[PDB]
């Protein structure tokens, strides 16, 4: 039986998903999440479906960029595995925390 070595599918995926532009989170779950959160701020809210898409376009772009900065932080510490402390530092230096 056949086995790709650890990393090899990982690099495959990077090329794949850096070549495309489709949203990577499932639509319906994201929508629920949005509704839950809003609901906690104000009850009985309706959403233009495009508002929900704007939110998802924005969140996904935010995180993909966070993951870029997060990666540089890992590589700065001579690792290839991103960890919570990497996210934490990237967020600190961005002025998020």
């Amino acid at each position: 039986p056949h086995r790709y070595r650890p990393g090899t599918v990982a690099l495959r995926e990077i090329r794949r998903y850096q070549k495309s532009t489709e949203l990577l989170i499932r639509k319906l779950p994201f929508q629920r999440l949005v509704r839950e959160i809003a609901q906690d701020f104000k009850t009985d809210l309706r959403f233009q479906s495009s508002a929900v898409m704007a939110l998802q376009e924005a969140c996904e772009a935010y995180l993909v960029g966070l993951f870029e900065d997060t990666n540089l932080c890992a590589i700065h510490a001579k690792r290839v595995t991103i960890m919570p402390k990497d996210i934490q530092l990237a967020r600190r230096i961005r002025g998020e925390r």
């Binding site: 690099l11 090329r15 850096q18 704007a54």
Partner: peptide, 18 residues
Amino acid sequence: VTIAQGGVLPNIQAVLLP
């Protein structure tokens, strides 16, 4: 600025290549 449905530039950090 974020360009909806734009994706990102292909870019893989060298140390990650085999």
